[PDB]
Design an enzyme around this catalytic site. Structure first.
Site, PDB file in Angstrom:
ATOM      1  N   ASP A  82       0.818  -1.205   0.000  1.00  0.00           N
ATOM      2  CA  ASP A  82       0.000   0.000   0.000  1.00  0.00           C
ATOM      3  C   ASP A  82       0.855   1.261   0.000  1.00  0.00           C
ATOM      4  OD1 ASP A  82      -2.007   1.853   0.172  1.00  0.00           O
ATOM      5  OD2 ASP A  82      -2.519   1.426   2.260  1.00  0.00           O
ATOM      6  N   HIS A  83       0.746   2.038  -1.073  1.00  0.00           N
ATOM      7  CA  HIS A  83       1.449   3.313  -1.192  1.00  0.00           C
ATOM      8  C   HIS A  83       2.959   3.210  -1.006  1.00  0.00           C
ATOM      9  CE1 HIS A  83      -2.585   5.129  -0.958  1.00  0.00           C
ATOM     10  NE2 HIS A  83      -2.021   6.198  -1.490  1.00  0.00           N
ATOM     11  N   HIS A 195      -8.989   5.822  -3.771  1.00  0.00           N
ATOM     12  CA  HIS A 195      -8.266   6.166  -2.553  1.00  0.00           C
ATOM     13  C   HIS A 195      -8.992   7.254  -1.774  1.00  0.00           C
ATOM     14  CE1 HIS A 195      -4.062   4.548  -3.903  1.00  0.00           C
ATOM     15  NE2 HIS A 195      -5.048   3.750  -4.268  1.00  0.00           N
ATOM     16  N   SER A 198     -13.114   6.876   2.797  1.00  0.00           N
ATOM     17  CA  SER A 198     -13.587   6.325   4.060  1.00  0.00           C
ATOM     18  C   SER A 198     -15.085   6.568   4.189  1.00  0.00           C
ATOM     19  CB  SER A 198     -12.849   6.961   5.237  1.00  0.00           C
ATOM     20  OG  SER A 198     -13.390   6.526   6.471  1.00  0.00           O
TER      21      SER A 198
HETATM   22 NA    NA Z   1      -2.843   1.242  -2.824  1.00  0.00          NA
HETATM   23 ZN    ZN Z   2      -3.153   7.513  -2.921  1.00  0.00          ZN
END
Ligand code: NA
Ligand code: ZN
Ligand code: NA
Ligand code: ZN
Lengths: 292, 292
Positions: A82-83, A195, A198
């Site tokens: 992730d990232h 992304h 939430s």
């Molecule tokens: Na990602």
């Molecule tokens: Zn991002």
């Protein structure tokens, strides 16, 4: 049971549904996510941030996942970085056993973003690992996304389409640019990633606030946001914040209601259950349930 | 680096020092314990209760330990079944990869305790696994302990010698029966184990209470109790309560000082540190530090 990230996302791309990408930082989170996948018969896209990898140690991160895979050998699992922020970080993940890596250079100009991303793609692809990238600019330009995808040969792309996140933070209400999403989808014809979306479900909120928590600063997008994004072409939805809140809500509750409680199980069992339910509901919402 | 329980405890038996037996229920606890052993150059006796095994899954329990062993190849590690209650439980632990198992039948009469213990020993020894048993009855009788050890061939024994614990709970404040301990040690000539000897360090108690905790019912014993025990021949000191209080104390603190905090790392990082420090100090106190 580890498979290329693209194997899971290509199916979602072809069949037009979304796959939740759930982060984990320890056993409790990982176990809950797997149980959710098992109970909803959904493919598993598991994420580990660079911070999580430092916390667990990349050996423990991959190690635990492999163990869980043997428990549920029938569930497709993608282990995703992730990232990632550097080529070396992505490289380490590849050698460690990750089946998918994200290189985030979206804070750089197009050319530099494309350069670094292409470098990662060449390395990962040569090792049979899928790659994710991110592109904006303010909202992404569809034609730029088209060229970016073509020249980089990335497997999936995270386009800036309305969420206040990363290098695309803005002031005000996040709004899904549906038509822009569809345009990007048409021009790139690859799995798309969302992304900074939430949701903060009502029940999750209420659980956290009841336990004496404070969520001022964490406002979620409506469930409609996620649903519409999936209909627009989103195939991967990053999910972390929602998991944390549900988990910690239970931890706070146990602490509040019994000052003499120090049995870890008493804290983390309910915490796991809360997190599991968030994952299960997310799977049904995005349409990955019963896809195994 | 997995070694048989007796390898570690026999060295402690010969050289007259104590090895802390530290329980774990998840990654955080395990990591802190290993870092402690690494930083104090002490052998590691890792414990997993039947409850912990149910919680983690025996595959994850052993799996995580194996991973940690690869991190610190220079540290001797014994994986121990804490308070096994049945032959099948001990057997499952052995097949899973545990290098030490305890069968607790101390609530049974001598003959039945000896019979079950002997059966477990036969099975474990056949697989090259060390075995611990428990004996009392009220305080243990040295001559009975002598016969029990001789006939059972058990590797180490946990004698009832003053602690309120298991089938030997009592009302008053625990006192170590030093001379009885010496007699048992003298007659059995094997590594001895101390149960129910929680010694909450001052700083640990303060930390937990400051965080709004309540320790009514967890008084425990002074450090001197542990010290005299080791002088008497105790080589294995079960340590669990002390670890969990230190751990949860930090969790409570984080929850108290920031209602908006739901980053698991923010909770468990300080929790690990606190637990690690308890283990490090316990290692130095018992005298296992610098024994690698
Ligand atoms: Na990602
Ligand atoms: Zn991002
Ligand atoms: Na034990
Ligand atoms: Zn006992």
């Amino acid at each position: 049971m580890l498979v290329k990230g693209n194997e899971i996302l290509l199916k979602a791309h072809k069949e037009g549904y979304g796959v939740g990408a759930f982060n984990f930082v320890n056993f409790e989170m990982l176990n809950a996510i797997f149980e959710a996948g098992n109970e909803e018969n959904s493919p598993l896209f598991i994420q580990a941030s660079e911070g999580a990898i430092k916390y667990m140690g990349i050996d423990m991160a991959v190690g635990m996942v492999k163990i869980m895979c043997e428990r549920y050998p029938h569930i497709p699992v993608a282990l995703h970085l992730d990232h990632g922020t550097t080529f070396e970080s992505c490289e380490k993940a590849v050698k460690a056993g990750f089946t998918s890596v994200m290189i985030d250079a979206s804070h750089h100009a197009f050319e530099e973003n494309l350069e670094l991303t292409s470098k990662v793609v060449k390395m990962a692809h040569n090792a049979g690992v899928s790659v994710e990238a991110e592109l904006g600019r303010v909202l992404v330009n569809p034609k730029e996304a088209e060229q970016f995808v073509k020249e980089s040969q990335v497997d999936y792309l995270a386009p800036a389409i309305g969420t206040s996140h990363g290098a695309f933070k803005f002031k005000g209400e996040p709004k899904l640019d549906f038509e822009r999403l569809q345009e990007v989808k048409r021009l790139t014809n690859i799995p798309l990633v969302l992304h900074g979306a939430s949701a903060i479900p009502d029940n999750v909120r209420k659980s956290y606030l009841d336990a004496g928590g404070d969520l001022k600063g964490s406002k979620g997008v409506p469930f409609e946001f996620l649903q519409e994004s999936v209909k627009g072409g989103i195939n991967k939805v990053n999910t972390d914040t929602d998991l944390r809140i549900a988990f910690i809500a239970e931890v706070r509750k146990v602490a509040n209601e019994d000052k003499s409680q120090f049995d870890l199980r008493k804290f983390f069992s309910p915490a796991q259950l809360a997190l599991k339910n968030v994952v299960k509901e997310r799977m049904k919402l995005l349409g990955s349930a019963n896809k195994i």
